[PDB]
């Protein structure tokens, strides 16, 4: 939920920062300079991805042979569909009763 | 719940003849067919080898016996502690009979276990004290018999197994 | 999502049951008013 | 019908509360302490599906016949004491 | 009097049904 | 002939969150939960020289739960590349039943193992992790123990390789096996 989305956003931001640092290093070392030293840090950012790789290497890996999270748990979804259907049926019955009452006048 | 039970040891005609007469009297009373929950009575002992069954059997070692597990668990415990108990070698008898549910009242006729024995008439109450209808039915069912008086009416809540052990205690009677 | 939809269906069931109770009071009232007169 | 069948499947999937290895339903172990001659047989499993929907339709047609009897009494026994009914909840 | 009572009951039932329609639309709005 | 092939594995206490999440992902239960009870060992063996265990645990969180006495003996030394645990036997009893039988047959409270952990289920196999609590009488390892237990009759050891493969599926967690 929260932690999974946070780690995903963190990995996405890490990839974006790595791409930006690579582009900046290319633009700096292409033409003209001490700032090019920070370009080396871009390579360090690449190592961060490797750490993420390590983070993916020594990750959960529950089975690594099948798919986890058994069951879509959509029984609740089906129950909600039935509830909405009952609500619609009640609305239809109420509309019929209202038409009958209006005809009574 | 745990209702009384006794064994009027009749004679004169025959044991099977007396059993048939009691069954005919019960049928005249309106005993409906309800299967045959033949309750055995085996002895190996101060433990026991109670095999009476009420769709579950158990042996009451002492203190009326816990015997709260299923029959398979009890048999597994017995076969596991083969010899580790003090209760294999005594006479292993088995009583039988039919169980008829007249109307919210089941009656079972425990026949001769090893062959020398009586036919114990066992009844089952609904809620349970509660001897008014019990006595009204016992007097209309048999004659000078069915005294009962188990370890009941003391208040540990309608114990059947203690009554069954009391009935099996009739082994030394013959 | 499971907890969210469980709360949603609980709210829906509560609303439907309140609707049934109000309609029950209404039907009792109207049936008493109707059966009191025979045309 | 859909809700009953999916509830059946859901039940086929409550937890057994296993300690050694029950992996079943507490109704199975309840026969041990609490002697059940025929209760445990009735509490194990039963027939359902088409029969339950059929008897529900039977209840429906019985309600329809009761309503028809009431309407016939109202239309015919009008000068008679007007019988008054009230459904349950 | 019977007609007036019937009309009053009908008006009350119609008001209740309209209120229930409104709250049902609101609940379905989610 | 209900045998057992339970493997003895143990997981560090710090590595719990990832472990429970891995379990609930792969297979733990339908909304899994925990348990709470207290065990005790009864020792009465003069000629057999073998204290026969009896798990008269009372699930305090459950109301009227039957005492699930568990005996285990005769460790099977099959050497079939599996755990081959001792033959087990379960029996559900009522309140004070185990105490009454310990008083009648004659037992002695060897020791007490109060543990607590989470529940897990699979298709056939079972697994459980918990932690013991060295508490007083009215109330010593403090380590989660991941045991992959399979209780069933003898059969043909067909589920043995299946359980071994499923345990290897959780290799980043533990490497469970038998004991001496």
Please tell me about this protein's structure.
With 174 residues, chain B is an alpha+beta fold. Helix content of chain B is 25%, strand content 8%. A 4-stranded antiparallel beta sheet of chain B has the order 1-4-3-2, with no helix packed on it. The two termini of chain B are 30 Å apart. By secondary structure, chain D is mainly alpha-helical. Chain D has helices at residues 2-12, 26-30, 39-42, 50-76. The longest helix of chain D has 27 residues, at 50-76. Chain D starts with a helix and ends in a 13-residue tail after the last helix. The relative contact order of chain D is 0.07. Chain F has helices at residues 17-26, 97-106, 158-169; strands spanning 2-4, 7-8, 37-42, 67-75, 86-93, 109-118, 126-133, 147-149, 151-153. In chain F, strands 2-8-7-6-3 form a 5-stranded antiparallel beta sheet, with no helix packed on it. In chain F, strands 1-9 form a two-stranded antiparallel ribbon. Chains in contact: A-C, A-D, A-E, A-F, B-D, B-F, C-D, C-E, D-F. Chain A binds chain F through residues 58, 60-66, 68-71, and chain F through 18, 21-22, 25-27, 30, 169-170, 172. Chain F: The modification Phosphoserine is found at residue 50. Chain F: It comes from Mus musculus.
User: Strand sequence of the main sheet of chain F, in spatial order?
Assistant: 2-8-7-6-3
Q: Count of helices of chain F?
A: 3
Structural classification of chain F: alpha+beta
- Provide the helix percentage of chain F: 10-25%
Q: Which chains share the greatest interface? A: B-F, 17 and 23 residues
User: How would you describe the shape of chain B?
Assistant: globular
Computed Rg of chain F: 17 Å
Report, as a whole number of angstroms, the end-to-end distance of chain F. 23 Å
PDB class: gene regulation
Keywords: mouse mediator, gene regulation
Entry title: Atomic model of the mammalian Mediator complex with MED26 subunit
Chain A: Mediator of RNA polymerase II transcription subunit 11
